[PDB]
Amino acid sequence: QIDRLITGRLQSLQTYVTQQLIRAAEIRASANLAATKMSECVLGQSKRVDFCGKGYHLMSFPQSAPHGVVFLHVTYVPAQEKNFTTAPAICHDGKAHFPREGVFVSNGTHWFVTQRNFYEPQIITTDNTFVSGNCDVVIGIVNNTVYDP
Amino acid sequence: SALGKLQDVVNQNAQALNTLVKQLSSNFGAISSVLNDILSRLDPPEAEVQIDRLITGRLQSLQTYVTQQLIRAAEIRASANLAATKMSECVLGQSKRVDFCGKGYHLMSFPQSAPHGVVFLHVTYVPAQEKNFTTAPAICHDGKAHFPREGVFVSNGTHWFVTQRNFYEPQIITTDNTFVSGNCDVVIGIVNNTVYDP
Amino acid sequence: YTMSLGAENSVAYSNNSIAIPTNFTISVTTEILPVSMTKTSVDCTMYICGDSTECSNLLLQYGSFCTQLNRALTGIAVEQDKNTQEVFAQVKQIYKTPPIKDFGGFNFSQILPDPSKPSKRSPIEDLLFNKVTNGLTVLPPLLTDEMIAQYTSALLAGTITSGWTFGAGPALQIPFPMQMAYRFNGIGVTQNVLYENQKLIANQFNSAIGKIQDSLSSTP
Amino acid sequence: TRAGCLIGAEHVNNSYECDIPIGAGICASYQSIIAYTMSLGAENSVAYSNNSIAIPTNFTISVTTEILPVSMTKTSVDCTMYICG
Amino acid sequence: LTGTGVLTESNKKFLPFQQFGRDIADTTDAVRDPQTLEILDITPCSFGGV
Ligand SMILES: *[C@@H]1O[C@H](CO)[C@@H](O[C@@H]2O[C@H](CO)[C@@H](O)[C@H](O)[C@H]2NC(C)=O)[C@H](O)[C@H]1NC(C)=O
Ligand SMILES: *[C@@H]1O[C@H](CO)[C@@H](O[C@@H]2O[C@H](CO)[C@@H](O)[C@H](O)[C@H]2NC(C)=O)[C@H](O)[C@H]1NC(C)=O
Ligand SMILES: *[C@@H]1O[C@H](CO)[C@@H](O[C@@H]2O[C@H](CO)[C@@H](O)[C@H](O)[C@H]2NC(C)=O)[C@H](O)[C@H]1NC(C)=O
Ligand SMILES: *[C@@H]1O[C@H](CO)[C@@H](O[C@@H]2O[C@H](CO)[C@@H](O)[C@H](O)[C@H]2NC(C)=O)[C@H](O)[C@H]1NC(C)=O
Ligand SMILES: *[C@@H]1O[C@H](CO)[C@@H](O[C@@H]2O[C@H](CO)[C@@H](O)[C@H](O)[C@H]2NC(C)=O)[C@H](O)[C@H]1NC(C)=O
Ligand SMILES: *[C@@H]1O[C@H](CO)[C@@H](O[C@@H]2O[C@H](CO)[C@@H](O)[C@H](O)[C@H]2NC(C)=O)[C@H](O)[C@H]1NC(C)=O
Ligand SMILES: *[C@@H]1O[C@H](CO)[C@@H](O[C@@H]2O[C@H](CO)[C@@H](O)[C@H](O)[C@H]2NC(C)=O)[C@H](O)[C@H]1NC(C)=O
Ligand SMILES: *[C@@H]1O[C@H](CO)[C@@H](O[C@@H]2O[C@H](CO)[C@@H](O)[C@H](O)[C@H]2NC(C)=O)[C@H](O)[C@H]1NC(C)=O
Ligand SMILES: *[C@@H]1O[C@H](CO)[C@@H](O[C@@H]2O[C@H](CO)[C@@H](O)[C@H](O)[C@H]2NC(C)=O)[C@H](O)[C@H]1NC(C)=O
Ligand SMILES: *[C@@H]1O[C@H](CO)[C@@H](O)[C@H](O)[C@H]1NC(C)=O
Ligand SMILES: *[C@@H]1O[C@H](CO)[C@@H](O)[C@H](O)[C@H]1NC(C)=O
Ligand SMILES: *[C@@H]1O[C@H](CO)[C@@H](O)[C@H](O)[C@H]1NC(C)=O
């Protein structure tokens, strides 16, 4: 009778230890993920999409929790978007001009260059554009003046 | 104790094998742990019972050994996937991920073979010998606000310069390393300094 | 019912039109990640048999099963402490914030430790700790909750006063509206946008932090 | 301690790094055997102000080691021979 | 009902038909003495890991 009780309780204990080992592997994977988020979202700014919150990641703050960690991801979300008419290049003096860092936009009558994630229209000059080739190659190039400072 | 991670895996596998070999010495409630002794001592009606006890004990031991071997195989597979990720991102390229390829700003990495393992020599750049400077967000000149294109405005006490962020290299604040946005009335903490025009 | 994945959003695509954002929202979101479990240890001999010596004499016929169970539980127990060590102890310098909290309008009182509380926790961390409720032994964790809170306080002080510089070497101080501008340039937005609209970004950040505290206090 | 009663270790008021973990912030080390509350790290007060920055003037090329296991010993057990021979 | 334990005074007021007491984990932690009708808590004997 004691042998029957011993083998039953030993089978129960082996089952408990096996499922505890499986849960320990899962918790170790989650903790490795949490350490990766601690290194990449808190100690630096991450370019990885949706790794440190929804939106363009700015910073993160760690908070202790009972058997856990809570990351407060501070992110940048674009809002209040507006339509503009766009072109890949500007044709001026038989030359094709491409934006150095931004994008060509038009509000209907005038052409500007702006940064990609925020509307900040600036006059298309030779300081924020670069010249490559003529106007015969680029599909969709439009005619506009390029002011020279 | 530098190579303790590989030696831990080797010791765990050798200890699991030693436990599996040691479990043959247990009779598990039978009269003996040796099968030949039971087969030479008993008639098959009771030797069947003794062999059945030995079979269920050894089968439970073997299933247990296979269970932790599969769990350790999953752990080693996760570690090997991590090692392959480090080989792809630290050795075959330069990684922007902080502390993924060593402590500091990661420059490059070297792989080295190890018994059942890999050793990454992470060559990183660590800033050192830092110095205080008085800083401002923008420079006010001719009613216009000037912001650095890639650097930062610093002052050693009397003169204002612009420098790159991770190394002190002071340069004259010009129109070639600054850009103009708005007037001086909006930016909090803007200071007055000249901007040289080449 | 048949479920619905989402609302239909026909994007107005054409070959010469673009959509450019004119404004922004500073959004703070929560991510909760488990790190460790309760470290449990089982006396196998006492669990199977208690104080019966005949039971232990019969249990010795099965060999070293109890040793394997104890060693597996010991490995799990030290693995939990290793997990906590890898997650929270990523800095060897304990940083403190300055006594004057002049960060250019940015408010961190909901995430910095409260000096009035004896546990030295943040109000958010205090709310998080309030919202969580035979041979068997429970081993205590190696790092107490006070030291885990101290580690998070050091990480917060480093990322507030020194940027990402403390994670790559010595902590180099930098003003917070400059740190923010650097982060803006990391996501491809010019510094001027941050500087001109710094009051609005600080107000949005404080409002989002308050909404985080309200949402944690209002969601079971 | 909160972990239990520790006999044979002299409790000290100084804080060192953890050598042998006891638990609940208690660690033991040999120097006789002493027991102490661990020290997380060296204290370092960052000189923050709203208009001062620290710029590095030099650098260190630092090489660090990272050891990662890849495979185990490939073991095979004849189940019939192990159980029965 | 046999066992091993430390028998201390109990603040649990039993109803007169009840004799033993159990917790969530189905372990006898309260009992009534048959000689004198008083309630005793049964703490398990002190044990721990060495
Ligand atoms: C597109 O933007 C330009 C620049 O903001 C606008 O041009 C100005 O329009 C106002 C309103 O009539 C005039 O007072 C200014 O003199 C114009 N500036 C220049 C340099 O001409 C233009 O009107 C906008 N177009 C549309 C359709 O909104
Ligand atoms: C943009 O400018 C170019 C150059 O001035 C224009 O190309 C000329 O178009 C006329 C009419 O089709 C032709 O007679 C010329 O021979 C073209 N010149 C060259 C060099 O190709 C072009 O039509 C303009 N596009 C727009 C939309 O105004
Ligand atoms: C800040 O740096 C500038 C640039 O080196 C220093 O200006 C020079 O100082 C030397 C030392 O007397 C003079 O010989 C040079 O003529 C100065 N250059 C110019 C353009 O004036 C300046 O002295 C430094 N200030 C401090 C407080 O260290
Ligand atoms: C930086 O320069 C501006 C422009 O000269 C100064 O602003 C002037 O300040 C005086 C007195 O404070 C006023 O009378 C003027 O009307 C201001 N002009 C403008 C255009 O705002 C400013 O004070 C200077 N700042 C420093 C610190 O020298
Ligand atoms: C940009 O222009 C497009 C096309 O005019 C707009 O898309 C329309 O939006 C209305 C309002 O929701 C819908 O009823 C139409 O069906 C849309 N048309 C197409 C072709 O998708 C779009 O809303 C404009 N964007 C902005 C920011 O004004
Ligand atoms: C960008 O969005 C913000 C809101 O996040 C706008 O700020 C609001 O402006 C209105 C009117 O100016 C005020 O009544 C609100 O109190 C402001 N909200 C906050 C939180 O400050 C801002 O005006 C928007 N800017 C642009 C150019 O559209
Ligand atoms: C930063 O935020 C805290 C909390 O939102 C502000 O503290 C509040 O201050 C007002 C008036 O001073 C009180 O009515 C509230 O009860 C305070 N709340 C708490 C939770 O204490 C604080 O004023 C903000 N600013 C600074 C500079 O700390
Ligand atoms: C930059 O300046 C600050 C303040 O002038 C320096 O911080 C002080 O450093 C001394 C030296 O260890 C300490 O005794 C003080 O307690 C510090 N003050 C504060 C407020 O932290 C800092 O050392 C300077 N940086 C450099 C690189 O010299
Ligand atoms: C930057 O740090 C390096 C150390 O890595 C300095 O190089 C040392 O300079 C001293 C004196 O000039 C020599 O005695 C050492 O032999 C040099 N070490 C090595 C490895 O070459 C260097 O001088 C520092 N530079 C500055 C500007 O501080
Ligand atoms: C864009 O589409 C219009 C018609 O929808 C066409 O006339 C025009 O040539 C196209 N432009 C480019 C660059 O494909
Ligand atoms: C910095 O703080 C001082 C007071 O300590 C204040 O006079 C000054 O205006 C502040 N500068 C900025 C840019 O906030
Ligand atoms: C048993 O005897 C004692 C003393 O003689 C008395 O106090 C107690 O009430 C008795 N119990 C019962 C059940 O009669």
Coordinates of N, CA and C in Angstrom, one line a residue, chain B residues 60-123:
Chain B
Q60 N 10.3 4.7 -16.6 CA 10.1 6.0 -16.0 C 11.4 6.9 -15.9
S61 N 12.5 6.2 -15.6 CA 13.8 6.9 -15.6 C 14.2 7.4 -17.0
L62 N 14.0 6.6 -18.0 CA 14.3 7.0 -19.3 C 13.4 8.1 -19.9
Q63 N 12.1 8.0 -19.6 CA 11.2 9.1 -20.0 C 11.5 10.4 -19.3
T64 N 11.9 10.4 -18.0 CA 12.4 11.6 -17.3 C 13.6 12.2 -18.0
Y65 N 14.6 11.3 -18.3 CA 15.8 11.8 -18.9 C 15.6 12.4 -20.3
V66 N 14.7 11.8 -21.1 CA 14.3 12.4 -22.4 C 13.6 13.7 -22.2
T67 N 12.8 13.8 -21.1 CA 12.1 15.1 -20.9 C 13.0 16.2 -20.6
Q68 N 13.9 16.1 -19.6 CA 14.9 17.2 -19.5 C 15.9 17.3 -20.6
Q69 N 16.1 16.3 -21.4 CA 17.0 16.4 -22.6 C 16.3 17.3 -23.6
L70 N 14.9 17.1 -23.8 CA 14.2 18.0 -24.7 C 14.1 19.4 -24.2
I71 N 13.9 19.6 -22.9 CA 13.9 20.9 -22.4 C 15.2 21.7 -22.6
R72 N 16.3 21.0 -22.3 CA 17.7 21.5 -22.5 C 17.9 21.7 -24.0
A73 N 17.4 20.9 -24.9 CA 17.5 21.1 -26.3 C 16.8 22.3 -26.8
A74 N 15.6 22.6 -26.2 CA 14.9 23.9 -26.5 C 15.7 25.1 -26.0
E75 N 16.3 25.0 -24.8 CA 17.1 26.1 -24.3 C 18.4 26.3 -25.2
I76 N 19.0 25.3 -25.6 CA 20.2 25.4 -26.4 C 19.8 25.9 -27.8
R77 N 18.7 25.5 -28.3 CA 18.2 26.0 -29.6 C 17.9 27.5 -29.6
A78 N 17.3 28.0 -28.4 CA 17.1 29.4 -28.3 C 18.4 30.1 -28.2
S79 N 19.4 29.6 -27.5 CA 20.7 30.2 -27.4 C 21.4 30.2 -28.7
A80 N 21.2 29.2 -29.5 CA 21.9 29.1 -30.8 C 21.2 30.1 -31.8
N81 N 19.9 30.3 -31.7 CA 19.2 31.3 -32.5 C 19.7 32.7 -32.1
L82 N 19.9 32.9 -30.8 CA 20.5 34.2 -30.4 C 22.0 34.3 -30.9
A83 N 22.7 33.3 -30.9 CA 24.1 33.3 -31.4 C 24.2 33.6 -32.9
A84 N 23.2 33.0 -33.7 CA 23.1 33.2 -35.1 C 22.7 34.7 -35.4
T85 N 21.8 35.2 -34.6 CA 21.4 36.6 -34.7 C 22.6 37.5 -34.4
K86 N 23.4 37.2 -33.4 CA 24.6 38.0 -33.1 C 25.7 37.9 -34.2
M87 N 25.8 36.7 -34.8 CA 26.7 36.5 -36.0 C 26.3 37.3 -37.2
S88 N 24.9 37.3 -37.4 CA 24.4 38.1 -38.6 C 24.6 39.6 -38.3
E89 N 24.3 40.1 -37.1 CA 24.2 41.5 -36.9 C 25.4 42.2 -36.4
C90 N 26.3 41.5 -35.6 CA 27.5 42.1 -35.1 C 28.7 41.8 -35.9
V91 N 28.8 40.6 -36.5 CA 30.0 40.3 -37.3 C 29.8 40.7 -38.8
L92 N 28.7 40.4 -39.4 CA 28.4 40.7 -40.8 C 27.9 42.1 -41.0
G93 N 27.8 42.9 -40.0 CA 27.3 44.3 -40.1 C 27.6 45.0 -38.8
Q94 N 27.3 46.3 -38.9 CA 27.4 47.2 -37.7 C 26.0 47.4 -37.1
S95 N 25.8 47.2 -35.9 CA 24.5 47.2 -35.2 C 24.3 48.5 -34.4
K96 N 23.1 49.1 -34.6 CA 22.7 50.2 -33.8 C 22.0 49.8 -32.5
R97 N 21.8 48.5 -32.3 CA 21.1 48.1 -31.1 C 22.1 48.2 -29.9
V98 N 21.6 48.8 -28.9 CA 22.4 49.1 -27.7 C 22.6 47.8 -26.9
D99 N 23.9 47.5 -26.5 CA 24.3 46.4 -25.7 C 24.0 45.0 -26.4
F100 N 23.6 45.0 -27.6 CA 23.5 43.7 -28.3 C 24.8 43.2 -28.8
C101 N 25.8 44.1 -29.1 CA 27.1 43.7 -29.5 C 28.2 44.3 -28.7
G102 N 28.0 44.2 -27.4 CA 29.0 44.6 -26.4 C 28.6 45.9 -25.7
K103 N 29.4 46.3 -24.7 CA 29.1 47.5 -24.0 C 29.8 48.7 -24.7
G104 N 29.1 49.7 -24.9 CA 29.5 50.9 -25.6 C 29.0 51.0 -27.0
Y105 N 29.5 52.0 -27.8 CA 29.1 52.1 -29.2 C 29.8 51.1 -30.0
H106 N 29.0 50.2 -30.6 CA 29.6 49.0 -31.3 C 30.3 49.4 -32.6
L107 N 31.5 49.0 -32.8 CA 32.2 49.2 -34.0 C 32.2 48.0 -34.9
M108 N 32.8 46.9 -34.4 CA 32.8 45.6 -35.2 C 32.9 44.4 -34.2
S109 N 32.9 43.2 -34.8 CA 33.0 42.0 -34.0 C 33.8 40.9 -34.7
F110 N 34.4 40.0 -33.9 CA 35.1 38.9 -34.4 C 34.5 37.6 -33.9
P111 N 34.2 36.6 -34.8 CA 33.8 35.3 -34.3 C 35.0 34.4 -34.0
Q112 N 34.9 33.6 -32.9 CA 35.9 32.6 -32.6 C 35.2 31.3 -32.2
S113 N 35.7 30.2 -32.8 CA 35.1 28.9 -32.5 C 35.5 28.5 -31.1
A114 N 34.6 27.8 -30.4 CA 34.8 27.2 -29.1 C 34.2 25.9 -29.0
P115 N 34.6 25.0 -28.1 CA 34.0 23.6 -28.0 C 32.5 23.7 -27.6
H116 N 31.7 23.3 -28.5 CA 30.2 23.5 -28.5 C 29.8 24.9 -28.3
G117 N 30.5 25.9 -28.8 CA 30.1 27.3 -28.6 C 30.8 28.2 -29.5
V118 N 30.4 29.5 -29.3 CA 31.0 30.6 -30.1 C 31.4 31.7 -29.1
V119 N 32.5 32.4 -29.4 CA 33.0 33.5 -28.6 C 33.1 34.7 -29.5
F120 N 32.3 35.8 -29.2 CA 32.3 37.0 -30.0 C 33.2 38.0 -29.3
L121 N 34.2 38.5 -30.0 CA 35.1 39.6 -29.5 C 34.5 40.9 -30.1
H122 N 33.8 41.6 -29.2 CA 33.1 42.8 -29.6 C 34.1 44.0 -29.5
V123 N 34.5 44.6 -30.6 CA 35.3 45.9 -30.6 C 34.3 47.0 -30.6

